[PDB]
Design an enzyme around this catalytic site. Sequence first.
Site, mmCIF file in Angstrom:
data_model
loop_
_atom_site.group_PDB
_atom_site.id
_atom_site.type_symbol
_atom_site.label_atom_id
_atom_site.label_comp_id
_atom_site.label_asym_id
_atom_site.label_seq_id
_atom_site.Cartn_x
_atom_site.Cartn_y
_atom_site.Cartn_z
ATOM 1 N N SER A 1 0.806 -1.223 0.000
ATOM 2 C CA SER A 1 0.000 0.000 0.000
ATOM 3 C C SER A 1 0.841 1.277 0.000
ATOM 4 C CB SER A 1 -1.013 0.019 1.161
ATOM 5 O OG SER A 1 -2.123 -0.816 0.888
ATOM 6 N N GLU B 1 -4.449 -7.297 -6.517
ATOM 7 C CA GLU B 1 -3.423 -8.181 -7.089
ATOM 8 C C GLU B 1 -1.974 -7.706 -6.896
ATOM 9 O OE1 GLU B 1 -3.818 -11.420 -8.834
ATOM 10 O OE2 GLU B 1 -5.578 -11.292 -7.545
#
Length: 265
Positions: free
Chosen positions: A40, A138
């Site tokens: 992230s 993904e």
Amino acid sequence: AEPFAKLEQDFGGSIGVYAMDTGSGATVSYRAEERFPLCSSFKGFLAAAVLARSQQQAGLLDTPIRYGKNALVPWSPISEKYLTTGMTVAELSAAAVQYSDNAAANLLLKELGGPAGLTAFMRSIGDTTFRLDRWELELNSAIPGDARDTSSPRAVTESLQKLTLGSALAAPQRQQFVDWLKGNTTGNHRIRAAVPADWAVGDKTGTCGVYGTANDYAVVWPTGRAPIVLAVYTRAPNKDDKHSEAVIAAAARLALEGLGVNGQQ
């Protein structure tokens, strides 16, 4: 090197660090040019790219995005909450940075022409290492030896410095980027845990959930000196290896110590 190697040994995986003292130019490197999954942490750079675009597209930040339930992939707690109203580009950006909201990140990626769009922005600021290839979720696969969706600690730190302290963004956008990083909610146990409570910190974390892969990057303002910019990345060889926030905090402390910066009273 030896202290970082001992940290690796106990953790059971690999650690990559690059720290720069913006005052003197002093650095600490350990595996600084090796590739680690972004997880992230790409979302910080995504927000910076959105801010850059706003400089040439008036009103971008205020633009309402009205998404459907189809956009709500897992780990989108802010996006879910605002489903019935939608969210502005600014709101999506804050959610992506400060809560690692997946849906918000995907919507913003679409705004910029996808993973390739964000990559082309990073190239524009001189970052030749960063690559984002895939979308949420993904991009989190963190398969050892896979170059997709990776960067290096050094490239992350250099790009972070350019965007928060250098000239990559115009002054208003630069301050907005800094403020978003400062308001992060996900990093209290990482770089933040390496410094005293009254040093300003802005950060963005990544936590793939697999292959012991997690990270944090930050700008840190120690009381009375020039800011430090640093990146701490981890990976590990087995899919089920657990990440460690503690190892990231410890590596951050070592990096800062190597720069003559420590939180000791």
